Amino acid sequence: EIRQNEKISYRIEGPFFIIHLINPDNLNALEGEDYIYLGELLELADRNRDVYFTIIQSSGRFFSSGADFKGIAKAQGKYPSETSKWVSNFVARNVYVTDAFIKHSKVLICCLNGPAIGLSAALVALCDIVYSINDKVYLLYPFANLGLITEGGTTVSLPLKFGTNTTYECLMFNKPFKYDIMCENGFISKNFNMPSSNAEAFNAKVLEELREKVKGLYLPSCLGMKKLLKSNHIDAFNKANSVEVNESLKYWVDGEPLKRFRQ
Amino acid sequence: EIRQNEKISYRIEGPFFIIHLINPDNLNALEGEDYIYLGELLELADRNRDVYFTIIQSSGRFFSSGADFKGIAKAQGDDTNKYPSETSKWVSNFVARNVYVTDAFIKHSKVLICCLNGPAIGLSAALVALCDIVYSINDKVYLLYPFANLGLITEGGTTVSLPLKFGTNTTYECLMFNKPFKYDIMCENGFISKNFNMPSSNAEAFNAKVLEELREKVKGLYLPSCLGMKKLLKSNHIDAFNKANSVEVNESLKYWVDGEPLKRFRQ
Amino acid sequence: EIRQNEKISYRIEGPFFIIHLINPDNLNALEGEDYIYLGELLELADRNRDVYFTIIQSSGRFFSSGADFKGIAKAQGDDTNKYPSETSKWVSNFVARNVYVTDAFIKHSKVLICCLNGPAIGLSAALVALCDIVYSINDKVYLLYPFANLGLITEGGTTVSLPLKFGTNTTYECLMFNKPFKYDIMCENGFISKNFNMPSSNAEAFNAKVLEELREKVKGLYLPSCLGMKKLLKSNHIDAFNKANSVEVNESLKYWVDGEPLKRFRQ
Amino acid sequence: EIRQNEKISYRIEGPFFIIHLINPDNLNALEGEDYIYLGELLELADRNRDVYFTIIQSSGRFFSSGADFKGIAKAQGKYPSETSKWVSNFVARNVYVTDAFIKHSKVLICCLNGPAIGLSAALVALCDIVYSINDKVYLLYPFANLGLITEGGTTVSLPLKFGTNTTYECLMFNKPFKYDIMCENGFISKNFNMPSSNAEAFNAKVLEELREKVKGLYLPSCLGMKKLLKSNHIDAFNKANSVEVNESLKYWVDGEPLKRFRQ
Amino acid sequence: EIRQNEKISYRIEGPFFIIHLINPDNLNALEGEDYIYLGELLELADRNRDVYFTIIQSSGRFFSSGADFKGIAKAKYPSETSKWVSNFVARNVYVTDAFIKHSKVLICCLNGPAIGLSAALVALCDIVYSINDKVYLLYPFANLGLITEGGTTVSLPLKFGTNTTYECLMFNKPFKYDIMCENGFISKNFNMPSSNAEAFNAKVLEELREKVKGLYLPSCLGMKKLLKSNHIDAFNKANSVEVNESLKYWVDGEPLKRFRQ
Amino acid sequence: EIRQNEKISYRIEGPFFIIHLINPDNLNALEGEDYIYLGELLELADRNRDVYFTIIQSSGRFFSSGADFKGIAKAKYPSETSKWVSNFVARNVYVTDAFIKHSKVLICCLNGPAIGLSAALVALCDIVYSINDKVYLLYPFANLGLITEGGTTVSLPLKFGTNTTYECLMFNKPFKYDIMCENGFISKNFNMPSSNAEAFNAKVLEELREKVKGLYLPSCLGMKKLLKSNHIDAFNKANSVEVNESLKYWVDGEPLKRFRQ
Ligand SMILES: CC(=O)CC(=O)SCCNC(=O)CCNC(=O)[C@H](O)C(C)(C)COP(=O)(O)OP(=O)(O)OC[C@H]1O[C@@H](n2cnc3c(N)ncnc32)[C@H](O)[C@@H]1OP(=O)(O)O
Ligand SMILES: CC(=O)CC(=O)SCCNC(=O)CCNC(=O)[C@H](O)C(C)(C)COP(=O)(O)OP(=O)(O)OC[C@H]1O[C@@H](n2cnc3c(N)ncnc32)[C@H](O)[C@@H]1OP(=O)(O)O
Ligand SMILES: CC(=O)CC(=O)SCCNC(=O)CCNC(=O)[C@H](O)C(C)(C)COP(=O)(O)OP(=O)(O)OC[C@H]1O[C@@H](n2cnc3c(N)ncnc32)[C@H](O)[C@@H]1OP(=O)(O)O
């Protein structure tokens, strides 16, 4: 049991805990409290002994356009200092949600129904397995354009999943990680090659294949294996989370991102 | 330049940035915003090219009794759904403040010296254990980390600093059973570099006496060497501290959300 | 000098210590004692100062179908309380053998080359992934790690080797859903350094052809440089592999003791 | 539920899982299967949600004189090779029991009623807290005298708990870690200063103090704190366990320890 | 302010500190003091607050054929050990360190092949652009009686994979264009003729000027500072071990024999 | 087989390779080439299969007063950087590495104080025995305008604790006998007069001969091999970073000024 959120729903079907971003008119842009909510849903799925897979699905043509810029503007009018304000508004929320993904014990699968940007794209890169709707998906990490730095564990996940040199080209120059680069790095495990106009049919088709794939598997093995796999990089992720959120503060406090967030 | 805080002052004397906890009537108990303020002062000292040493001093008979429990009660009474959930509330009230201040100490590039004028407790005691050098007023100082009694876990990097500075076995005895790290234990582990053996009734004299000795000790030294050496020494455990900070702050959340610490903070 | 094993032979030709799995009628399935024997052969090669390369070759259409399931059934039927508990039994039958052979591969100082003449499965496929260089007979080879289907977890250092050599996401897809790492995936990750594109019906010709090319490739090289370079390269991940070996072998115990794999090994 | 072992008993009193070595006539020397049994008891305590502390107590004048040398002689007469034999008899048992201690999630307390030697002394050094009966206790790691190397995680635990230089003096020259050195390094948290002739009264007195000390504590905090503390060195211990057991093999296979075990 | 070097020039254009290897007749082979000079240039660029990108460009058909073998023959000392500590150890540990710690975005304009220590430096850069599909990297340590240098112990498995690294290093085989492209080592191939490195160099600078427009450059550096921390310890450890372990090879004499022919 | 050095001798007695600093009139101050020579001696002892213990002994009232300041003044080069790479970087990275990797049990007979790089080497030994309670270690980096050397970045916090390390290093204070004994840095104080280092040296060797009786010596080495792996990576990383970061101090000139007076 958890509060309701009109932008994000969830349900459980057998061993699958399914989270659904349901705000396609706003390209599933997320406010701080929505990222927190995502973290709480992961933590709920993590405590449920019948759940073995946590599946993140979205809606419309974008997976998520990232942090809601209107909400960011709203966070500019209560705090004794700029530092205090950003510690509460940015630091807290980013460390919490990134942590929830890093430590999650269930197999985390992203159904990528369209592009993802910023912190939302970081979360995609923290998932264990990614399936794409079609070859038009991309991930964009526009930190250099926003006057920010790496977020959501991307310091670690991008070099790990895309290579160091590619990561520098994309991050330093604000270029997307496109479908081709995702496929070449084995970031996407299956492209479903469905039309962008029916995320819903894509979402259902992934779940249908997943039901077939798990048949006959000893599901506790999935979790036991993930527990060992996670240990390869868990320290690097936790270290990155702390430094990312604290090093980003000076950018917020300087003011550059607020200017740029307001074209 | 920075806002004023009636509980914590600072000044600069030569190469020393001196922070002073100045609320002895409340045993220098600190609220969330005071911890944040401390972090901001460290960051100010860290950016000042004339500063080589950041000296933390307090007042009265306690260094600091830790987090202000009245302020914690404040942060429980809501007004009225200011936060969408208990989780959101504690992310903002506890997680944010702890990760920020702990980080400010962990990364600080100036030599960080604690003048321990009495006992320290909880998160304040964690900040003491993050300092590079500690001087004690007398043999009645102790550090207490009462997490087991409060329904909490390690904070402020103590997951790393205590085993590092006191040994693993001693750390488990103290933390698991809510027992203080007393003067004798501090001295046996070289945690305290000098005991000044002054009366507890004059923190001011102790504070002045440490500053006086420091002015003498720095004479003739090449101060950029101090900082260059610290830069290398810090790299021994920087990763462990950064990893611990993130994990401590997130793992404590379930204790707050469960409610146990609020019950206990209210007896 | 070492005992003989009718399933695995070896010989030395110049700087090459050549190990040959020679039980094609049973797809070179291996029992516990055969894995141990493999470790002993590696240790023999490692002590021979004339050996610079340890080459592992097999026979027939499979490199190895993995652990021999008949032998596993053998190790279930007791005779009759030979072991005081299920735990004791599996410590001796599984834990011991896996930690030993995995360690022999992880620490091996000679250049370890796998001639992949067909598919490999399970612990045998883990040993392939521990080799420094892999050459394939043709594009029908694959590696399968069917742990999820057998009620087991990662073995033979695959916790480390698979994400390292295939990427994390691909590893989770294959391991979580019991899907093979196919030729195309091997080639895309540079796991296979050369595909010889020969028919599956002649592992012998493939084996000979790899040895022939190797004799050519080593000409003019300073062979101690190969070993010196490997010594440094190994240090990149040696700690991760040693940590994984201990954890894999101990964490698998509860799966054996629970009984699930025995059920499944028996269909 | 677990098989019975005439040399080692256990029971549960409230939040305490108490393990008792009960073979004082043989100085609580332990055979391979007894070390395995200890591991299984730890694993049982670890799975019991009412247990917060796992307390290891012994009997008589020695905590344990270490591996039973008669049993070692017995392991010399079935295996295709010396290697196979030692993999089964030594490697398996050492990795298993050392692992059980390294990963144990409950607070592990050793009641040190007398000296400990060899692998038994390694296990004492893996405990979180140690209480001594009196100032005559010592730990001896006689590997250099037996033609062996570090065991039971001592590669890590001894430098960690006693310092590097002291560890080299003791290990290289087969010298004990005596009471004074234990106290100076804070290895012993309390010396009870009771007579060596009543381990039983010592054991009971520790339990009596423990019952008093836990009053008012939030016990899940103890475990939550241990979980974080353990992470400081967990990787080093797991790495050491694997290399210790595999590097010791060549000593067994060479034969030196068997000669020496037989004066 | 720094001494001049006839083989290597530099200049600054806006946020770009541009280093230019300018000895094409000798395939930009470099002597010890030239490697040191490269390090000093990186350290100069690193201290300049207006610089955000350090761009390494070369000349002619080769990026660099590596260490100058005539200079090695050219190389007072109480022992062989002392000699090689001074001639090889010192220089390698210094220049490798300068690249490992550099805080500005390091971009290599790869105008042709690179070999040996020069190829190690290419592998330490953050971004690599190639002139055409004839570029390759060669690490001929096994043929020279040497071992890994310039952080290659770490950079090659990291950027090319472990298995591929072993095949190339153990058997003295090049990392060719195709292998570079499949591992994303090259971020863009400009597909220009090998006969005009200058035009390639100018074209990269032109595209860079376009790509930085609108970016908040301190973000580039802030991000690099975090990214660097993923492997900084491994690189520092490898540098020390590479330089010390190679000593026994030099002292044994094998490389000197082979460097002759 | 190795060159002779008038300041440092060695010999082998059974399983002991004994190195003897024999320049008491100059308090066994060591020049660069002497540090290199020490490294070469360790590497010789390490390759000798009959050696299980490498014992470092000195002469007179000091173990060693550290780097020879006359030799530093004495210290052709295209730049200050090149000079210090060759004179300081090379020598420090080499000798520190020789101690860090040494596989035999390394025992220091501390016959008096040690300073600077020599004191760093003492801190890298596995076991230390003191002549009497007047020994101390001094690391005067802050007074010389230098930083940590010889692996002290790691060895001092490891062997003395972090807080104590900061007090001593930041303020140029000695690690005295009492601090050494409280941290178990000294395994035995022989309590002999400072006027007879020779007798102390002989007495330690005598006790060592007694202590090894009955031990299986390959166990000593097998155990050390594992023990070393606890911190080997940290020491190798520190060596590289120490030697490179000190460069800017030498190049700035401060230490040379101060080394004068
Ligand atoms: C592409 C680059 O290279 C540029 C950069 O790196 S700089 C930063 C990149 N972009 C961002 O950070 C956030 C914006 N993301 C986007 O995708 C841009 O909106 C886009 C113009 C590129 C997409 O265009 P599009 O597909 O036509 O979507 P668009 O019509 O803008 O959005 C649909 C609605 O959702 C809203 N929305 C989308 N993303 C949002 C966000 N992050 N915050 C708030 N609202 C958002 C839009 O404002 C719009 O609302 P209205 O109908 O009220 O105008
Ligand atoms: C056996 C153990 O090991 C016991 C344990 O304590 S476990 C719980 C740990 N304690 C805490 O968390 C810290 C809170 N403070 C204390 O427990 C006690 O104040 C102390 C034992 C540490 C000191 O004892 P003391 O000198 O008698 O304190 P006291 O006289 O109350 O302090 C003077 C004033 O400062 C106030 N104050 C002190 N610490 C405070 C805090 N952390 N928050 C808010 N107010 C505080 C007191 O309430 C008091 O104000 P009033 O006179 O207006 O009530
Ligand atoms: C969809 C998936 O991804 C499926 C999965 O398989 S998950 C379970 C993974 N499989 C295993 O663990 C390995 C066991 N072997 C096999 O599954 C199958 O043999 C295989 C599919 C890998 C190969 O298919 P195949 O060529 O038809 O094998 P098969 O003809 O049985 O082998 C020839 C002989 O070798 C024997 N043999 C092969 N592998 C053996 C093993 N691991 N243990 C004992 N005997 C074995 C066979 O039993 C057979 O002997 P008989 O003719 O006397 O019965």
Ligand SMILES: CC(=O)CC(=O)SCCNC(=O)CCNC(=O)[C@H](O)C(C)(C)COP(=O)(O)OP(=O)(O)OC[C@H]1O[C@@H](n2cnc3c(N)ncnc32)[C@H](O)[C@@H]1OP(=O)(O)O
């Ligand atoms: C002290 C050193 O420095 C020497 C060394 O390092 S080398 C190895 C050190 N010792 C060992 O490894 C194992 C032996 N441990 C001991 O404590 C020696 O028995 C000791 C002589 C030093 C103790 O003397 P003690 O207190 O009089 O005990 P002791 O009378 O030997 O033992 C009581 C009984 O328990 C038995 N026992 C004790 N430890 C045992 C072991 N590890 N294996 C088998 N049986 C054992 C004894 O054999 C004896 O049985 P009996 O009555 O049948 O003779």
Ligand SMILES: CC(=O)CC(=O)SCCNC(=O)CCNC(=O)[C@H](O)C(C)(C)COP(=O)(O)OP(=O)(O)OC[C@H]1O[C@@H](n2cnc3c(N)ncnc32)[C@H](O)[C@@H]1OP(=O)(O)O
């Ligand atoms: C079996 C094998 O496969 C051999 C190996 O790979 S192992 C050795 C690999 N290569 C090295 O170690 C570096 C030495 N350089 C070379 O071998 C060659 O330059 C090369 C094979 C890389 C390319 O060959 P190329 O394009 O024909 O070079 P070339 O046109 O001769 O170069 C022009 C001039 O620069 C010189 N030069 C090139 N590299 C040099 C170096 N590292 N040091 C000094 N001078 C060098 C050439 O010697 C030549 O000078 P001269 O005309 O005065 O003799």
Ligand SMILES: CC(=O)CC(=O)SCCNC(=O)CCNC(=O)[C@H](O)C(C)(C)COP(=O)(O)OP(=O)(O)OC[C@H]1O[C@@H](n2cnc3c(N)ncnc32)[C@H](O)[C@@H]1OP(=O)(O)O
């Ligand atoms: C404020 C402070 O507290 C100062 C500091 O600590 S910072 C500087 C610390 N010390 C150093 O850096 C090393 C230099 N050595 C010394 O200062 C002194 O030797 C010492 C203080 C360590 C001991 O003093 P001492 O016991 O009186 O030495 P002394 O009897 O003069 O030595 C005998 C000879 O050896 C020489 N010697 C000692 N150390 C030497 C070195 N490192 N290089 C060259 N020669 C040296 C002395 O100069 C003297 O030679 P001359 O008679 O030819 O001048």
